[PDB]
């Protein structure tokens, strides 16, 4: 039912992940100030496709491949997750 | 050193006697476990300590090629006594 964990996956150097790094440095502090009790896990690796996982009440997870996605589109998909 | 256990079995120089709940006592029924009475700890302790004159000596087993490799033992200490590694013969100097 309710949202329990989000977690983001990305790379530090593959440009398909750019827009996620910019989104982090732009909106992460704002998002955490808006959701100070929610955990949201940012884990970066070398060469993988970005993802965004949404952990609901039971073991119910939802992925969306936000590869080569501008930061505004990242934030739109993320608000779709939050709502 | 052939003390027995409360179960009634004999005990080896390697304290090994099967526990009372171990099913592997069946093999000793109408039978017996081979355990040696002549222990080496007791029998090497039942030997004197060889006073010597020097501070370094040499121990073969006693037969030359029938003993063990010729090693050398220091005897500078007086808190204790020297001791061979192959055999267990002890030494001292005065």
């Amino acid at each position: 039912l309710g949202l329990r964990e989000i977690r983001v996956h990305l790379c530090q150097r593959s440009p398909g992940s750019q827009g996620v790094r910019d989104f982090i440095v732009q909106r992460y502090v704002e998002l955490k100030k808006a959701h100070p009790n929610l955990p949201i896990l940012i884990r970066e690796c070398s060469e993988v496709q970005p993802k965004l996982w949404a952990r609901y009440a039971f073991g119910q997870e939802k992925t969306v491949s936000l590869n080569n996605l501008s930061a505004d589109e990242v934030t739109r998909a993320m608000q779709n997750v939050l709502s | 050193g052939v003390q027995v256990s409360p179960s009634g079995e004999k005990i080896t120089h390697t304290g090994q006697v099967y526990d009372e709940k171990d099913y592997r006592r069946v093999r000793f029924v109408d039978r017996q476990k081979e355990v040696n009475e002549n222990f080496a700890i007791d029998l090497i302790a039942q030997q004197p300590v060889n006073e010597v004159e020097h501070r370094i000596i040499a121990c073969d087993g006693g037969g030359g090629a029938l003993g063990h490799p010729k090693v050398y033992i220091n005897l500078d200490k007086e808190t204790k006594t020297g001791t061979c590694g192959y055999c267990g013969l002890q030494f001292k100097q005065h």
């Binding site: - | 526990d19 709940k21 171990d22 099913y23 592997r24 006592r25 069946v26 093999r27 029924v29 109408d30």
Partner: protein, 342 residues
Amino acid sequence: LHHAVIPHGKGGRSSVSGVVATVFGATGFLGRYVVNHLGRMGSQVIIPYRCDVYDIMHLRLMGDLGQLTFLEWDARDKDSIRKAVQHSNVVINLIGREWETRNFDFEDVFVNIPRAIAQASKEAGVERFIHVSHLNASMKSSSKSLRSKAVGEKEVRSVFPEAIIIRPSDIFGREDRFLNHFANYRWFLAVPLVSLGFKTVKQPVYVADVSKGIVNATKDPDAVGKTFAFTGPNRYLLFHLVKYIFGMTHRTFIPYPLPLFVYSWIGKLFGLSPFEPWTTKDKVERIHISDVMPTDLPGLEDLGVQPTPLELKSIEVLRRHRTYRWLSSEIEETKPAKTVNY
């Protein structure tokens, strides 16, 4: 739980199960299969034997090193039984005879010996006890053997509860006394049957099934106060069963009726023998009473064995009796027996 009775291995020879077992009728016909199925998965099997060492050789194998311990005993003499069950978890009574002797009657086989064994088992402190009665075991039966076996089944509960009492039908196997017994009626040029075999029903079972059943019951956390009916499938009518025997053994078939009193006298004078008799009064009686409909009780499939039909394993038993001109004949040329339900 001692550290040595912890099961290890991939479930085979040279492994461990924790099934230290005293098997008292091991020198027989069911006990050899029991010991085989125990050693096949790794388990110590104490085997008390009174016979000569020549007749324990086939049991000397069927187990890895040190897992088969034989020790001599005597039913008359206690302290030859405590000595056996002194270190065991399980005890499996298979003792039984198809005739009395000067030294041992049926009471002193099915009643007093299980009572002593179970007393020793309770005093030693073992966890289980597998008694083997008969399916027809009833205090109101016709045979001394069956009444004695019901009395033993009751007295074993009275002494050692938390027990397992298996009640098989008449078992068939390579060296049985059921199919071989009916097939050895060729040496007489005609076979007698009470009422021509009708009004009699037989639900035989195979040795491997009973053996696997015992060998799982010694590990099942269930089956502590449960009786079992090791019957097998395909209830058979005696005339058709003997016809199938004498078709698979391709000799001939000359049936004819015979009353029970003259056939009983025949069994008596055959049992007049110092050696292993061919026939006995109690054997005739046990042959000519039907097997109970066993569906009031669990059976094999409640224990982890799918029963085997007679038609698939009988040739292994019956090809011994064939002649040349028929020894090289297959299972699918005997127009199988006619089953009944009743």
